[PDB]
Amino acid sequence: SLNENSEGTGVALGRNQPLKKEKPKWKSDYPMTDGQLRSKRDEFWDTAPAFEGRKEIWDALKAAAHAFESNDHELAQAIIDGANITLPHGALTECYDELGNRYQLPVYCLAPPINMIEEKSDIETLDI
Numbered sequence: 001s002l003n004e005n006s007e008g009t010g011v012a013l014g015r016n017q018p019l020k021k022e023k024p025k026w027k028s029d030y031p032m033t034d035g036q037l038r039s040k041r042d043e044f045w046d047t048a049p050a051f052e053g054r055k056e057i058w059d060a061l062k063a064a065a066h067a068f069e070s071n072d073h074e075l076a077q078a079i080i081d082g083a084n085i086t087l088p089h090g091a092l093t094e095c096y097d098e099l100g101n102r103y104q105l106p107v108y109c110l111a112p113p114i115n116m117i118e119e120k121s122d123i124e125t126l127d128i
Contacts, residue, residue, distance in 0.1 A: 005088060013088040017081050020073055022091030024107035031117040033126050045106075053101020057085060061095055061103060065110065068092040 006012035026048035028040040060079050067075030076092050084098050093105035107114050118126075 014090075015086055015088045017077060017087040018090035020068055020076060020090060020092035022089055022093055024093040024105050024110045025091075026104065026106035027114045031114060033118045033123060037114075037117045048104045048106060050102065050104065053097045053099060053103055057083065057095070057097055057101075058103075060085075061105075065092060065105075069110065 001013060004012055006015060026041075026045050028037055028044065031037040031040065060083060064076035064079040067079070080086070080092070080095055085095050087094055087096055091105075093110065095103045097103070117123075
């Protein structure tokens with residue numbers, strides 16, 4: 001959806017959190033080489049954690065990550081949405097708290113494929 005946060009309309013995507021298919025955010029959506037990775041990494045990094053929200057809720061977020069890591073999607077839903085906290089996204093790597101807070105979770109705690117990037121799946125020699 002092109003920039004849809006249910007603005008001008010009461011609920012659109014669904015402000016409550018569906019299945020957590022979303023990826024951890026802070027890195028390049030299309031990382032190319034080391035330079036591309038590192039440069040865009042920092043760029044997106046700037047926009048990732050922002051201010052934070054609630055260390056009190058953090059406990060639930062990491063516990064949900066625990067279940068979700070163990071393939072327990074339902075557990076993490078019952079935790080996040082179980083509090084009051086919700087998402088129009090549907091991520092375990094994101095949570096929006098009732099106080100107007102948002103948490104954005106980097107891949108370093110879930111998925112490390114976006115660390116090397118330039119494997120021999122395509123990259124060989126970036127000379128041009």
